[PDB]
């Protein structure tokens, strides 16, 4: 095979440094084509003799004099003549065939001139269009991750092939140019046309291609100079800056960077930090070294209209991206198969960095609902996959893209947190420092971190492990899934088995370990911490730590630091329940949530009866804290989805109304009649969920609150009296109770909304009407770009479908309008998969299955496109629902009847 037909680069040539000059043209040509021009020189060293240069190039046209490149020797080195240059599209290469061989130890410079489309494709060097008044603005920006640096200039575009970069931007003289590094000095006029300026940037450190960035825009900044001279700037649209929306990001950045410099035992490795808010950046955020990009909703914050969960999103997303400025950027994983270590690490430490900026919020707890239980839903499937993938199976750009999923990020985070916990943070930080210092400006595999952590373990006598760090972590990284740990408290016997939600599933992926793990197990007995225990790679063991007396109780996995779920014999469950009903504060709040999370999953897997899971919600009438209530609500939304059109619903409603009333009443006093929010984040979250649960289950005191506040708003439109935290519930319930006066008022507010997040809440609340006619009229609007944006059409139809009354209307509308498929699957995506999922989510009967089959019977032309598999998934999900309702209906009805009084 020829090397230019292989996806991995040769190792014969390694880059030293690059000069790259880019010039975006932000005015289109005659035909509406936007382009950029560039010029580059790469200096590389020959390691082994070769008569071919292979370098990456994607969607670039070459205008170099002669062949596509010019090739020179550095210093007094001679250079072979070029035979020919060709582009090989499949493997994204520019190939320079030479008439003789390059020589080991010699350096060469390769110069090229090129151009590409400055497309609106969020890839490489690209354009982004947005509105300022009647005016349409266009800026130029970059997204290299993973394999798109090559789409902006020819480069050895693999993460381990690091080099220094000298970037220059040629741009309109009234626009600002930003890159990884500071400008060298003031811009100078382009001599051939002084309407353009030339901005040169300081040389980057040795770094990876995927982390480069350069941006040309009208943006402005808010700034601060940290004590060590590091300049910090938040960049955004002029009007966003003037509004003060960059201030929260600016406030937290300084503390976050200080936290990480200390955590990592390493100085921030750059002279400045720019972070930029881009309108509609669909990738969310990108950790470009010294110039981190974000979508606006992720970086900007409007105190007057934004909720607290909004603030939580800003501080954690910043902490995540800043974490990479060391872990990922300074020390880079050598290949994409180890992506999980980079993203998993940042996904864990984002909570630590954010906790430093907001220390009263207990943010570290949020990893449990946010990543652990979230990823366990997909890792408890037969179709999961290990964190680890062999390097040689990850080759194409598409294979690289598949590394970026829930397992890599959320299981990565969970497993790393588990590791830090069983090591202790102090020891983990020691190894982490050692790793960063040894590999700074270089590349690694996950085995290198384990080695440095082992060095830390071996240098102390306190923490003793049952095996090497690598052998333990291999159990968590080389095989998919996680165990359920089951304890028999009468004997103290403990067992582990691979946990699958579907007790009838066939696992066909084989494990080198037979799905046995080495498991760290903390425990608490009658509210007192016990000695730590390790379950070895055995199915079964026994320890007196897990043996109780019938008045005692024991609980495993404190704070769910371990990546596993726990089951007990029935008597121990009842003892835990008794404790939660008589003095809950003895069980850590995270474990009060765990009991609910785990037991609903166990009931799904048929390991406990569903009534045991429901019994675990009974303590909630005395619960004031956020997480355990959130656990219940996440675990019951499926119950509500299946039963909200059945005789089960009244009793379920009555049951939830009874559980939530004391909490609603608690906050009524605490908030001084809803006039002031709880102080800390968790309590604000608890209040939000309490109002939401109250209103949606028909608590009269909540309905009355919603009506009063919305009435008050309608009588004084410019002064919204509803705190951002409570808007989504208050808006929804007031519209549900009301009619066309409320609906028309909210529609008018939607059409003048300036802020995306406010517009979203309104769009969602409008779907809460209980008038069939209003919902059909609304559906009719969803396909009009004048009234409802394209990108919002399917969300809106979905919100309507989630209304019990809107369910038939949306389903009818989708079936009947399906042929908006020969109109919306050609110019722009239009997520069809999410629409199918959304409107079919409820289906739980044979009759509904028939309709979905009957409907599918229209493959005869049309097809489905982006949602072809989504439809198949809807048929399989409906069958699973049919079977679940049949097994569960009778038992669940009687439980709710029995416990609603």
């Amino acid at each position: 095979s020829k090397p230019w037909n292989r996806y991995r680069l040769p190792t014969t040539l390694l880059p030293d440094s690059y000069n790259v000059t880019l010039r975006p043209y932000l005015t289109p040509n005659a035909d509406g084509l936007y382009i950029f021009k560039g010029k580059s020189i790469v200096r590389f060293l020959c390691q082994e003799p070769t008569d071919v240069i292979i370098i990456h190039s994607k969607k670039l046209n070459y205008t170099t004099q002669g062949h596509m490149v010019v090739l020179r020797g550095v210093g007094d080195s001679q250079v072979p003549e070029i035979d020919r240059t060709e582009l090989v599209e499949l493997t994204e290469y520019l190939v320079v065939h030479l008439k003789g061989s390059l020589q080991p130890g010699h350096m060469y410079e390769m110069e090229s001139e090129f151009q590409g489309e400055l497309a609106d494709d969020l890839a490489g060097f690209y354009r982004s269009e947005y509105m300022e008044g009647n005016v349409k603005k266009v800026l130029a920006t970059t997204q290299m991750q993973s394999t798109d640096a090559r789409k902006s200039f020819p480069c050895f575009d693999e993460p381990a092939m690091k080099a220094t970069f000298n970037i220059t931007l040629i741009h309109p003289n009234n626009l600002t140019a930003l890159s990884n590094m500071p400008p060298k000095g003031s811009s100078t006029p382009l001599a051939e046309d002084p309407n353009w300026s030339v901005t040169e940037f300081e040389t980057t450190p040795v770094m990876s291609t995927y982390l480069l960035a350069y941006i040309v825009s009208e943006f402005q900044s808010v700034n601060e100079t940290a004590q060590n001279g590091v300049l910090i700037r938040i960049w955004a649209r002029p009007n966003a800056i003037a509004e003060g929306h960059g201030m929260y990001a600016l406030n937290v950045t300084g503390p976050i960077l200080n936290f990480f410099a200390n955590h990592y035992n390493t100085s921030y490795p750059l002279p400045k930090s720019d972070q930029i808010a881009l309108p509609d950046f669909n990738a969310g955020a990108m950790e470009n070294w010294g110039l981190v990009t974000y979508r606006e909703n992720a970086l900007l914050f409007d105190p007057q209209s934004s909720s607290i969960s909004n603030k939580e999103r800003v501080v954690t997303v910043i902490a995540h991206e800043l974490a990479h400025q060391w872990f990922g950027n300074l020390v880079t994983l050598a290949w994409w198969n180890d992506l999980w270590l980079n993203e998993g690490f940042a996904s864990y430490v984002e909570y630590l960095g954010a906790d430093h900026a907001e220390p009263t919020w207990n943010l570290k707890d949020l990893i449990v609902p946010g990543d652990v239980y979230r990823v366990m839903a997909v890792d408890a499937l037969a179709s999961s996959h290990p964190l680890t993938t062999p390097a040689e199976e990850v080759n194409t750009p598409a294979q690289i893209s598949e590394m970026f999923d829930s397992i890599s990020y959320s299981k990565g985070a969970s497993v790393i947190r588990m590791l830090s916990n069983f090591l202790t943070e102090d020891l983990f930080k020691e190894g982490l420092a050692s790793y960063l210092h040894a590999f700074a400006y270089q590349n690694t595999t996950y085995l290198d971190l384990w080695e440095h952590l082992q060095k830390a373990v071996d240098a102390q006598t306190s923490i003793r492990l049952p095996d090497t760090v690598r052998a333990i972590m291999d159990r968590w990284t080389l095989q998919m899934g996680f165990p359920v740990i089951t304890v028999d408290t009468k004997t103290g016997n403990i067992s582990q088995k691979h946990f699958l939600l579907d007790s009838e599933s066939n696992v066909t992926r084989s494990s080198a370990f037979d799905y046995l793990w080495i498991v760290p197990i903390s425990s608490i007995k009658n509210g007192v911490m016990q000695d730590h225990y390790w379950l070895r790679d055995v199915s079964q063991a026994q320890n007196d730590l897990f043996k109780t007396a019938s008045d005692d109780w024991v609980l495993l996995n404190v704070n769910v630091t371990g990546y596993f779920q726990v089951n007990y014999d029935e008597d121990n469950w009842r003892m835990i329940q008794h404790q939660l009903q008589t003095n809950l504060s003895v069980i850590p709040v995270i474990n009060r949530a765990q009991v609910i999370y785990d037991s609903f999953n166990l009931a799904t897997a048929h390991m406990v009866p569903v009534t045991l899971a429901l019994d675990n919600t009974l303590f909630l009438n005395g619960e004031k804290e956020y997480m355990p209530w959130q656990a219940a609500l996440s675990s019951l939304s499926y119950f509500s989805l299946m039963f909200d059109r059945s005789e089960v619903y009244g009793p379920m409603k009555k049951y939830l109304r009874k559980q939530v009333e004391p909490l609603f009443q608690h906050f009524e006093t605490l908030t001084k009649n809803w006039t002031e929010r709880p102080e800390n984040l968790m309590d604000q979250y608890s209040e939000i969920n309490a109002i939401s649960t109250a209103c949606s289950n028909g608590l009269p005191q909540c309905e009355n609150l919603a009506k009063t506040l919305f009435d008050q708003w309608m009588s004084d439109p410019e002064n919204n009296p509803i705190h951002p935290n409570l808007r989504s519930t208050i808006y929804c319930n007031a519209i549900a109770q009301g009619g066309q006066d409320q609906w028309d008022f909210a529609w008018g507010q939607l059409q003048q909304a300036q802020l995306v997040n406010e517009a979203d809440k309104l769009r969602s609340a409008l779907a809460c009407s209980n008038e069939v006619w209003l919902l059909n009229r609304y559906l009719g609007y969803t396909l009009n770009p004048d009234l409802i944006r394209k990108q919002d059409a399917t969300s809106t139809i979905n919100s309507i479908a989630s209304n019990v009354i809107g369910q038939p209307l949306a389903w009818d509308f989708v079936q009947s309008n399906w042929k908006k498929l020969f109109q919306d699957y050609g110019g722009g995506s239009f997520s069809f998969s999410n629409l199918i999922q959304g409107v079919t989510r409820r289906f739980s009967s044979e009759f509904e299955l028939q309709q979905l089959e009957q409907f599918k019977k229209n493959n005869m032309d049309v097809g489905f496109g982006s949602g072809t598999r989504a439809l198949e998934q809807a048929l399989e999900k409906t069958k699973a629902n049919i079977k679940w309702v049949k097994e569960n209906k009778e038992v669940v009805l009687n439980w709710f009847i029995e416990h609603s009084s």
Partner: peptide, 6 residues
Amino acid sequence: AAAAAA
């Protein structure tokens, strides 16, 4: 954007 929602 990379954080991790609950």
